[PDB]
Design a protein around this ligand. Structure first.
Ligand SMILES: *[C@@H]1O[C@H](CO)[C@@H](O[C@@H]2O[C@H](CO)[C@@H](O)[C@H](O)[C@H]2NC(C)=O)[C@H](O)[C@H]1NC(C)=O
Ligand SMILES: [Ca+2]
Length: 278
């Protein structure tokens, strides 16, 4: 459709819905371009869906709910987490109208600190999608970078192992290449082995990057404390909260501690909620 910036996300649970409102507020506080948010409807709570028109009127954004049913032929995922990961990567060509030329996935737990139109304008050199690589800058976490040894090191041949927390999809090129049909057919064949695609949303594009190119985004597009150094935080365009296998610190504790403006957005959205309620 007509918005300059089009973002979709997936959220399941009260905690992720609370963070999704914060992510949306952070996008609008950093851009003057028109924005439309797209929601994978079936995982959201009724209260979240009822509150979105109030967020839209307060922050000045458009929105649309997409309800796409998992195709009968396509191998299902019994685990809700894996089903949600399937919705991130398997249906990019069918979730959005043919008129939409580009969409960006932003994780529900992200904090945006840049004008997202800079990602819309980032050149992809013919790639149907662009992902940031996993950071190598936090050196003390090298033992946990599973992609630097074993299966992935041999498979990648020096190519980056990309994180799936943020990605830009040129829907025109994605369509042109039949990337959706190709990703669903590879997923269907690979998923017959239950050990394959452990990190479904991330492993599938990384696996297919020799035939479905990935434009490797600048590292500054995605900063996560687990893999990225403190020194590179000042250059981060977006901040992602991702699992830390070494510390196992809780999600809300990480959010409040890392990002000074997280509490500001959280309190601002709670103030908007009290204003609408009364
Ligand atoms: C959105 O538009 C406003 C208003 O034009 C911009 O405000 C300017 O902000 C800079 C600092 O960032 C100030 O030095 C200017 O004096 C402001 N101008 C006015 C007229 O208020 C704002 O920067 C814009 N934001 C984005 C992300 O484009
Ligand atoms: Ca995340």
């Amino acid at each position: 459709e007509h918005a300059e910036i089009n973002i979709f996300s997936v959220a399941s649970g009260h905690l992720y819905e609370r963070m999704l409102n914060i992510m949306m507020a952070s996008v609008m506080h950093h851009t003057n371009h028109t924005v439309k948010f797209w929601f994978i409807e079936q995982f959201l709570s009724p209260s979240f869906k009822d509150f979105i028109p109030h967020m839209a009127a307060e922050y000045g954004f458009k929105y649309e709910m997409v309800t796409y049913k998992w195709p009968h032929w396509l191998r299902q995922q019994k685990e809700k987490q894996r089903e949600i990961w399937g919705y991130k990567i398997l249906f990019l060509d069918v979730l959005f109208p043919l008129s939409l030329d580009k969409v960006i996935f932003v994780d529900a737990d992200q904090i945006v600190r840049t004008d997202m139109y800079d990602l819309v304008e980032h050149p992809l050199d013919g790639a149907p999608y662009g992902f940031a690589p996993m950071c190598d800058s936090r050196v003390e976490m090298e033992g946990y970078r599973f992609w630097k040894t074993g299966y992935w090191a041999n498979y990648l041949k020096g190519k980056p192992y990309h994180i799936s927390a943020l990605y830009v999809v040129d829907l025109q090129r994605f369509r042109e290449l039949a990337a959706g049909d190709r990703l669903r057919q590879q997923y269907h064949a690979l998923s017959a082995d239950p050990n394959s695609l452990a990190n479904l949303d991330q492993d599938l594009p990384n696996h297919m990057q020799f035939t479905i190119p990935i434009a490797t985004l600048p590292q500054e597009w995605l900063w996560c404390e687990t893999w990225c150094s403190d020194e590179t935080l000042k250059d981060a365009r977006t901040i992602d909260l991702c699992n830390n296998p070494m510390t196992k610190e809780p999600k809300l504790d990480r959010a409040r501690r890392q990002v000074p403006e997280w509490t500001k957005y959280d309190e601002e959205i709670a103030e908007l909620a009290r204003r609408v309620r009364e």
